[PDB]
Assembly symmetry: C2
Homo-oligomer: 766 residues x 2
């Protein structure tokens, strides 16, 4: 009967087991015992195994070394840096080649010709030219392509495999775009290999635009720039600024972006596309020599190159395009009249220049960056040691788990708090809540009568009205606030050295929610009405022990109000004479007037202690007249306030003297002696109220401990589950641990492995 | 001009003038202008006295034989008896002729022939009388009818007015019947005068049914007879029995009710109807003659009569029916076979017999009952004066108006409550709501710090949370509860022996409706939220007196929690040993364990006075196992609670020693050199909350006295108007003797006033 919810939960949990354990033991623990082992065994091994199955096709020799071309391995290096941190802050560490240019300028054809195959999709000319791809370029004995995330190898000399390759890229391309924008940053990684191909890694970035039309979002112009600027920021990047040769160089759109990362083109190269279509330029030195020497641009490049990107056909084969490129420059005026120099034309020269710069800087850059990221682990280890004693047990999610368990443990302990303490809290709160009605409305008007039956009748009328209307509602409010306040205390107590600040954030979020998901059963108001009456209903003090308990409670309740009245009267009337000459506590004029009015009312009460609270109005006038006659200024309001305080003091102190006489009054009632003024009936009232306070507190406690506290535990578990699923709450609560710093120390281990193995391969090839 | 009484008066004059031209007053003027014309222009015509002169002529010398007719006064006498008592008992005091008959027997045709006008509901084969109608017949040259309740006179010689009268009677009959029922007792009073009419009050009664026909509602069968009895039982009345003599008499039912109501035929007159129809459809001798002879039924009669009611046509005139009557009784069986008496047939003989018997019965019974009605008015005087010697003929509507005035005056008196009274109640309640939280949540954790900045940080955390989410919600509860409670008290608490409780019921009824309709304004919570904050935000104690008041307030709080802690300790640890020798009053076993734990914990605090408020699990275990070594049986919760009490005792006594220290120097606080030097953040804290509580109380008081009390008065006026609308809401408590007794006194005086002139006319006119 003390608690019932836990029994129900255990019962139905056992029933669920009895019916479904032959499945639940298999699903819940059997497999899960090995679950931590499974993760490595299942997926990781698989990714390795299929790779071996592909490598087994090659049939490489054991201990041969030189397993892969160095650049193919540097592709993994760049990929691991991208995965660890995709922000430019980490991209800046290693060399890259950026392929950027005006929208639909043929820059994709430039990259594909460098790659010696039509590897990227060109389905459309609007949305398919404004999305990123990345391709590594490697030496090989055969032109073959392989994705990071696929075991399939693509034959780059056949239309079917090139089409499938373009299809996979396209499937990634047409989805890695914000809706409407059609432009979003994302990584697609392909490794393209073959004879004649250099040691590079090229990133094709969304085509650059200057205006927006009805078929595109207005933000599209800015988003492209944001992507375009992201990879250009790399100080170790070679930026291929690819411009459509059919339009004025002064009108280049990409240039105005490149100048934001390299204001003078120090690390940039100029690429002139559509050379065999822009006849107005390739046939005239006055434009070409400025465009290719670096006089028509603000950019002073690493080099300047001219290429043929296709004769307006977005789907033209790369092989035909390269053959036509080699034929065109010979056909064109440009070679004869030396407006373009032989090393400034065709795919070969551009590829070789960018390859030499990129790969030299790659060799030195990884030799540097292996130690850079290893040094970053050493730098991460100084901070982590200094911040906390070396420890990695905790985690952000584990903070939620630990605060959850702390909260549920405190809620349970709350449910098993010694009940007696619950009743003590409820009893004291109830008395503080009710004493105002007890004395001001019930006792004060009732005990002024000259008949015990009228005392009890006034008391009982006020008690019936009060126990029916306000008192039950007040008791229910007290119980609600008691439960919520004790819950708050358990959630927040700074338990000395055993307190943890980190969890506090959750304790506040749950404490608020758990309270709002609980409501107290309103029916209590009616039950209390009955119960309260019953506790009052006992008016019979049968023996000395209950007589003394009754007198005790009456003395306590009346002494509190008497002390309050006496403090008010002391402030109102002023200091005594002793203070006035020993501490020079001189009275104010109001205090003197109040003192004289008090003296008038007090002589009246001293002569006749039976006087009721209410005077005649002509009595007020008489008091004013006498006070004025002696020389005291007084008005009916001063008399009424002084009268109220003074009569209450007289009333309560007379009640306590009646306590002093009740303590030794029993003979009068044995004898029925007629001259006996003493009748001790207030004692019964305060006895009844003490017992009613006890009964109300205990009933509220029982409702709390068997019905409401278990509902609170259920609501708290619901709140904790809802917060556990909420990722945002975990992000914005329980954030204090230093584990985040250690996560970098551990995660950069992939970058550390790729870079060191690349250094070893560098030495092996040399 | 500032603080000048005359200037204040002039400002008040301006403010009152603007209110005098308020939109309320302007709309009152605009609506009043139309109202002066609406329900107006009657007055100028009313001034003429010609109508009054005609009424005087009717009352005094009407210069025509009709004047001062004694039967005419008897009609008013019976009407005023009906007014005195809806219940039949008193209406039975005075004679009248009550006419009952078989349903659809033609009784209304008989009553029309006697009244000589088509003034009764006439129809073919249908219930004609459904609610009884009392028509009084008197002689006069003007054959005119007039309702008791109307001013329209109906000319009884013309069909338009006769039909209007009949259908108005039908409508009144229906309006006396509840929806879904057909028959009702309420009597319609029509005064009919014309030549040849006899002095005869005649009461048509709902037709009696052997059984309900299917179309008719069943109700009638029980209703009809009861109604008939109500009028039939009159010991001073004549029974005129109308029976259908053209049908099998075995099917008749009226004679059974007549025999029940007059077993001896003391004033019973029997009449057959439909005699002309009976000529071809005569009721067989074997059943009808035994009725005429009083043998089939106990009914005896003053004579057995018969009249013709027509041939079933509803439009038949009086003269036609009488002619047909004469032909029938000359030629038909009712006389030739000697059932009915020749002097007892035809309309004239029945009318004359009824008038003679009626007026002799009147002369004999009305004088006795008129002396008895003088006795009746003195009898009402006897009881009434005893009931209400001070007040005579008081009515519930008058009482409601008086209560409305008193209650609105009580609201105004509530406005008169001094502002300090409201502020005192509000502040005391407000402080009761937070002080425990002030120490438990702020002071205890704040005062344990080694850095007063964290003391103040704990202060500010708790105070800011409470101000943002709690204080503006507690303050409004305190204020609106305070207004409700004081509103209740002004309306109920007697001002000594001079209190009049007559309107206490009405006051209580107004109270709940007014409070429910009225609300405390929503805005308050925001303003309080700001105001409270600022009162706390100011941390600077302006002067020494304020600093001392802060220390006194702090001493109150700390002393209260210290005494509570000490009493809780005595509750758990049990009696002292000195108490054992003194009163033989010792520790219980649990109290023994508690005290031993307390002594060990007090040793701990003696060794370390700065021990933190929280015992760690190792400290708790040290206490547990040391007491177990002592043999005392201790557990972690016993020690946790005993430690809380003991430590708070130590902490609060130290806080009161600091109270004493802080008096000398606020500057020592300003120094903030070291903990040993005075560190009185405590005094400034209790000062800040002093300001918060006082300003909250005064803001609540101001909104009360300038916003909510006037809204309360408006709501009370509205509620008292709703009181005006509902009379039941005036007699919700069944103590209504006042109104009923007043009405009875006035109506009995009218009864006797009319009976006096009637009896004098008996002495003189006859």
């Amino acid at each position: 009967a003390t608690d019932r919810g836990s029994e129900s939960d255990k019962h139905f949990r056992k029933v669920s087991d009895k019916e479904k354990i032959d499945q639940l033991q298999e699903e819940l623990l059997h497999t899960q015992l090995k679950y931590q082992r499974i993760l490595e065994r299942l997926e990781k091994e698989n990714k390795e195994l299929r790779k071996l199955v592909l490598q087994k096709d090659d049939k490489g020799i054991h201990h041969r070394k030189l397993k892969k071309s160095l650049i193919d391995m540097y592709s993994e290096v760049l990929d691991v840096l991208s995965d660890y941190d995709a922000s430019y802050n980490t991209q800046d560490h290693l060399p890259r080649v950026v392929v950027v240019g005006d929208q639909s300028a043929g820059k994709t054809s430039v990259l594909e010709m460098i790659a010696q195959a039509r590897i990227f999709p060109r389905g459309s000319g609007e949305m398919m030219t404004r999305s990123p791809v990345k391709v590594t370029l490697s030496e090989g004995p055969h032109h073959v392509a392989l994705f990071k995330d696929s075991s399939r190898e693509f034959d780059l000399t056949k239309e079917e495999d090139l089409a499938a390759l373009r299809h996979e890229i396209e499937l990634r391309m047409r989805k890695n775009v914000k809706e409407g924008c059609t432009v979003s940053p994302e990584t697609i990684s392909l490794n393209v290999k073959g004879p004649g191909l250099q040691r590079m890694v090229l990133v094709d970035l969304p085509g650059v635009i200057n205006t927006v039309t009805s078929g595109m979002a207005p933000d599209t112009k800015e988003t492209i720039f944001s992507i375009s600027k992201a990879y250009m920021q790399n100080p170790n990047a070679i930026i291929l600024c690819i411009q459509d040769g059919s339009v004025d160089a002064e009108r280049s759109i990409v240039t105005d972006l490149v100048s934001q990362m390299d204001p003078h083109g120090r690390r940039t190269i100029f690429v002139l596309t559509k050379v065999d279509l822009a006849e107005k330029n390739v046939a005239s030195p006055s434009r070409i020599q400025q465009i290719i020497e670096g006089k028509l641009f603000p950019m002073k490049a690493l080099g300047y190159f001219a290429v043929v990107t296709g004769k307006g056909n977005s789907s033209e084969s790369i092989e035909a395009i390269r053959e036509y490129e080699e034929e065109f420059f010979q056909n064109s005026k440009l070679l004869k009249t030396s407006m373009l120099k032989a090393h400034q034309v065709t795919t070969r020269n551009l590829s070789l220049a960018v390859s030499d710069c990129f790969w030299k800087m790659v060799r030195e850059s990884v030799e540097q960056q292996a130690d850079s990221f290893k040094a970053t682990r050493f730098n991460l280890e100084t901070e982590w040691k200094n911040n906390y004693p070396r420890l990695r047990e905790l985690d952000r999610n584990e903070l939620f788990e630990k605060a959850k368990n702390e909260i549920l443990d405190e809620v349970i302990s709350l449910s098993q708090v010694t009940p007696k303490h619950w009743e003590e809290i409820l009893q004291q709160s109830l008395w503080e809540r009710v004493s105002t009605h007890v004395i001001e409305n019930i006792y004060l008007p009732a005990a002024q009568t000259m008949n015990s039956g009228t005392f009890n009748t006034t008391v009982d009328i006020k008690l019936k009205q009060w126990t029916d209307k306000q008192l039950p509602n007040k008791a229910v409010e007290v119980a609600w606030e008691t439960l919520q306040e004790e819950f708050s205390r358990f959630m927040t107590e700074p338990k000395g050295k055993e307190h943890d600040d980190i969890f506090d954030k959750l304790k506040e979020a749950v404490k608020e929610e758990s309270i709002k998901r609980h409501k107290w059963n309103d029916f209590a108001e009616d039950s209390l009405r009955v119960i309260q009456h019953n506790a009052l209903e006992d008016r019979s003090i049968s023996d000395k022990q209950q007589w003394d308990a009754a007198i005790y409670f009456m003395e306590e309740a009346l002494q509190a109000r008497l002390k309050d009245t006496e403090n008010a009267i002391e402030n109102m009337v002023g200091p005594d004479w002793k203070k006035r000459w020993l501490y020079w506590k001189n009275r104010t004029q109001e205090q003197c007037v109040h003192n004289e009015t008090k003296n008038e009312l007090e002589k009246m009460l001293k002569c006749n202690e039976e006087h009721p609270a209410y005077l005649a109005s002509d009595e007020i006038t008489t008091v004013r007249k006498n006070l004025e006659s002696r020389g005291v200024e007084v008005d009916p309001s001063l008399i009424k306030d002084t009268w109220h305080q003074v009569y209450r003091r007289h009333f309560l102190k007379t009640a306590l003297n009646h306590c002093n006489l009740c303590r030794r009054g029993f003979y009068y009632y044995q004898r029925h002696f007629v001259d006996s003024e003493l009748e001790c009936n207030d004692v019964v009232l305060f006895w009844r109220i003490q017992r009613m306070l006890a009964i109300t507190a205990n009933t509220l406690r029982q409702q709390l401990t068997n019905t409401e506290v278990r509902r609170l535990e259920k609501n708290v578990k619901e709140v904790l589950e809802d917060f556990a699923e909420d990722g945002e709450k975990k992000i914005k609560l329980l954030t204090g641990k230093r584990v985040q710093l250690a996560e970098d120390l551990k995660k950069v281990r992939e970058i550390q492995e790729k870079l060191d193995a690349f250094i070893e391969a560098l030495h092996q090839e040399k």
